[PDB]
Design a protein that fits this description.
WD40/YVTN_repeat-like_dom_sf; Methylamine Dehydrogenase, Chain H; DUF5074; binds cyanide ion; Surface layer protein; 320 residues; mainly beta; four-stranded antiparallel β-sheet; Haem_d1_sf; transport protein; globular; binds sodium ion; 1 helix
Length: 320
């Protein structure tokens, strides 16, 4: 297999980069999109998905998704015109959703023709403070967290491409996963000091997908800035960032007393679990200025390897 690491770079500086790591050789190649194509991705490489041999790289502040050949890293296509794209979720070969910040609409695209083919309007949301983020599928429904200056999960009917329900929670749910019991997990960041929207103790929520109801809420400390719920491949061990890297069984009624990886006065910023072998990768932004590092741990928190990537490594994509 292989591991892609997206590096956000510094917002408004256009130093986003792509890295590729071979776990069998413990070798990283940096700046791989430039190496293959002789131009740069742009500003804030946010997320990446692979479908049918094609890697889709969301470049948040370059209004673009690139489609790359996952072996040569060559650009094979692109889609432009996104307000500020976040995440891409495929419904079929000919339909995906692309979420957005600073927009009240989710973009619908045809990945086969490289086209925007529609919009989903979100209720009670404007361009000024709009935000849609990560997506999980539940039968014909997609659930989407509304992050920046928002406090909702939305439920979208993917047949009609319409928002059919919403749930209000604590401010700024950051991420979204679905465990093996069809329970969604989200973790809020709690906003920031000086925010026009608010600042509070963040929470981790377990939400039933069937009924769209909160089953558990674990409240953290004011000043915490949690993020990045992730699951293992079996979808029964939840991971997240809150200073440390934390994990717990998705069946837990209590939060852990010991983290998977202790805070070290750095900036743990991205997180993935190998879906096949359980190995945990942690992307550390360090101070958000210098070259970041990824840490590869065994399922027991033994460091297998670590390697320098680009600036502000934020997201991972497995090539299996
Ligand atoms: C600001 N994340
Ligand atoms: Na950048
Ligand atoms: Na933007
Ligand atoms: Na709004
Ligand atoms: Na967003
Ligand atoms: Na906070």
């Amino acid at each position: 297999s292989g591991l892609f690491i997206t590096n956000e770079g510094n917002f408004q500086y256009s130093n986003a980069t792509l890295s590729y790591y071979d776990p069998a050789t413990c070798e990283v190649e940096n700046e791989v999109f430039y190496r293959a194509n002789g131009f740069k991705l742009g500003d804030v490489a946010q997320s990446m998905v692979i479908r049918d041999g094609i890697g889709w790289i969301v470049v948040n502040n370059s209004h673009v998704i690139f489609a790359i050949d996952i072996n040569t890293f060559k650009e094979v296509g692109r889609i432009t015109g996104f307000t500020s794209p976040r995440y891409i979720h495929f419904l079929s070969d000919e339909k995906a959703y692309v979420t957005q910040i600073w927009d009240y609409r989710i973009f619908i695209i045809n990945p086969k023709t490289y086209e925007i083919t529609g919009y989903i309007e979100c209720p009670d949301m404007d361009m000024e403070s709009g935000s849609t983020e990560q997506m999980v599928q539940y039968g014909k429904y997609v659930y989407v967290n509304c992050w920046s200056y928002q406090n909702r999960i939305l439920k979208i009917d993917t047949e009609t491409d319409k928002v059919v329900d919403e749930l209000t929670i604590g401010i700024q749910p950051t991420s979204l996963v679905m465990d093996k019991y069809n329970k969604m997990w989200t973790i809020t960041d709690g906003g920031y000091e000086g925010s026009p929207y608010g600042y509070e103790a963040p929470s981790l929520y377990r939400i039933d997908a069937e009924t769209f109801t909160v089953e558990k809420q674990f409240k953290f400390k004011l000043g915490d800035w949690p993020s990045e719920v992730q699951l293992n491949g079996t979808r029964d061990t939840l991971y997240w960032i809150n200073n440390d890297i934390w994990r717990m069984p998705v069946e837990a009624d209590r939060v852990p007393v010991r983290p998977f990886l202790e805070f070290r006065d750095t900036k743990y910023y991205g997180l993935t679990v190998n879906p096949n072998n359980g190995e945990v990768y942690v992307a550390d932004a360090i101070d958000y200025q210098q070259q970041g590092i990824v840490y590869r741990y065994s399922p027991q928190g033994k460091l297998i390897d670590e390697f320098y990537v680009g600036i502000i490594p934020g997201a991972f994509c497995w090539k299996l």
